[PDB]
Symmetry: C3
């Protein structure tokens, strides 16, 4: 059976749970419940009161806690800034790629220090998300009558907002500061679609844990490559986030049902075997 | 009332900008500053100087306690920080002996304490996401440029002037730095990639200094010195550049003192508060 | 004093190489901690040589946790003047095919969190501020010795500066090349791979930096021979990199790497290095900004 963790009326809440992990405590307690008959657990990435900044989030504990609770999938959300004209505030992005600019975060479960699992794990990350789970997020958006924009098969002038972009690349910066204009334009020239602070190493550790992970990013701003009145700040992010979170909730809850309506035996076994085959110390 | 802090880089390890009236041997909640802070006056404008690398230049860029240096200057009541940095050029018109009043940067540093705020017990509580689109105090940048004009140094602004007005040595009116972690210099491969990205100079010390100054509600501006048989000529050129930057700094302090900064300082403090994500969540009863 | 002694740092596929008969096995410590493993001393011909596996005996130390400082300092303390190093890597360019080698001459550094200098202001480092030039970061004489060693072992050499593309005959040793060194342990995304390719980098690896930098800080002549084991992940899904792909290709190429390394040690031994060693030491002293 499947069980979907969510990192961030139609959700039946059962109770709240405190867990510990080999890598420390998660960001907060976890809300356990059900969507129809599918078990679901919800974890706030930045803790109660949003007091934990992106660089200090215990990604290892959060992903491992969901694994230890039996999660087979993780669906994740984050706010983000758009680097490109056709991704506008109020849009969503089902990411398929990233460029990592984070540092100083614990980004793997394995190593040679006592606080990590024994071994050397070199995971392939060419296409770093679970593709089946990406397509479920996109289909959930269709089921909730939210427009879907596929730049491979459509083009500008077919882009109807607010829309879910069917693909996109994120640069993840370490934070806590936002980017300079110089950095924003450099990331844009690299062809990246959005900028955020929390995707990495969350996505990497989910694959190390044998979990199917997909992210849907909420565009809250144009970073700072446009006009001065459109340069990102916290108030701007929060104002748009508050307008978009109801759509993102509808997508996520619809996707949990769609996951539970399919068989995942082979995908799960594939996930686990990918971890085993990536052990350099064992091979 | 204003008080100008000065962080002197290479060439300023033992600055003699004014007669020492007093010294402050202090620590901060974030550890020890690079050296004793030296107090005095430029005219009737109060000034505080500290050498980024300490006397004797014993502290490398990645080990400088940027948090403690900014905090210590804030603790003494500084409203402004003027900083110097010796840099290498990435573009043909930035020539050794030139200066740059930076307005942009690309950050390639890591492993440095770059914020006062967070969830660690020794951090200030709260989550601060500061805007950095234009990361310097613009009023203070223009003071540095005006100080150079007032001391008879060429100023070149590529936005309004053809490359024929680029007369060396000159202060470039704008420019971007890539800040690398050091201590090693860049490979040729790295230098050419930075050049292809359009960056003007390379240094090791701008970040997180500029970021922490904004977190502290201070007006910060930086003046870079472009520094690169020839070694003897490079060194003498650098000495002349340091004499020029000394003139610019002293004139800039006087120019800052000649104006009212009440509203700018209030805006500096208001920007910090508006960047507190944890407080803005609360103002709307979020979650 | 004109005595030469060649250290060898063995990467993946070199966890236990038989380059020579062991004379001494050295368990040492350094001011920067323990090296990756014991150091094996011996002779190749008349040339003294020291071998160290980068990842330890059972390949238990990931790239980001290797004590590069201790490895380089231990070799220096045993009297090495030179370090020859191997690394497995992925290709970012069509003319660099699995089974080729690359005598690197450039790099782009994307590592973090590693101790990358012997010098600093804290008690656990040597006293001083050392700013080493790195524009051409390898020892050029030692690079050319690796390239000559391949010629002497009848292994094709392809020099893009002087030869036409038609003279790129595989398997070959590329006479120049740039590496991007990523921190690991994960491999790159397709997005990252295409960005690195667009910057013009030739290969991707995890272990060159800070090893090459610390060697120069130590006054040692360092050169690297990279073994192409894969096309990273910018090509078809059947050529996307993974551990098994890396190991399988390496087993095939290790034989020729050993021949190059042993011939290179002999070629170093056949020349006088007095002025180059003096210049290596003088570059360290002139890069001290506290003095
Ligand atoms: N512009 C931006 N940069 C980084 N993280 C963000 N989160 C929301 N907007 C962002
Ligand atoms: N593609 C690759 N990336 C990083 N390190 C590697 N080692 C071998 N192949 C590699």
């Amino acid at each position: 059976k499947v069980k979907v963790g969510i990192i961030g009326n139609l959700f039946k809440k059962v109770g709240v749970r405190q867990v510990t992990t080999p890598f420390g405590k998660p960001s907060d307690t976890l809300v356990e419940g059900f969507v129809g008959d599918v078990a679901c657990v919800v974890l706030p990435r930045h803790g109660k009161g949003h007091l934990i900044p992106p660089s200090e989030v215990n990604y290892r504990a959060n992903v491992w806690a969901l694994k230890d609770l039996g999660c087979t999938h993780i669906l994740a959300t984050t706010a983000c800034g758009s680097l490109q004209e056709d991704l506008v505030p109020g849009d969503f992005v089902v990411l398929n790629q990233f460029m990592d600019k984070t540092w100083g975060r614990e980004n793997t479960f394995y190593g040679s220090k006592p606080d990590s699992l024994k071994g050397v794990l070199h995971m392939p990350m060419a296409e770093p998300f679970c593709e089946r789970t990406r397509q479920i997020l996109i289909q959930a958006a269709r089921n909730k009558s939210i427009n879907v924009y596929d730049k491979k098969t459509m083009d500008k002038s077919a882009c109807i907002h607010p829309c879910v972009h069917a693909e996109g690349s994120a640069v993840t910066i370490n934070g806590p500061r936002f980017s300079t204009r110089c950095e924003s334009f450099i990331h844009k020239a690299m062809g990246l679609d959005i900028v955020n602070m929390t995707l990495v190493p969350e996505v990497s550790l989910a694959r190390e844990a044998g979990l199917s992970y997909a992210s849907i990013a909420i565009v809250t701003d144009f970073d700072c490559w446009k006009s001065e009145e459109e340069h990102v700040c916290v108030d701007m992010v929060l104002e748009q986030f508050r307008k978009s979170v109801v759509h993102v909730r509808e997508i996520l809850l619809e996707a949990v049902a769609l996951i539970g309506a399919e068989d995942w035996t082979k995908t799960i076994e594939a996930n686990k075997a990918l971890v085993m085959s990536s052990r350099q110390d064992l091979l």
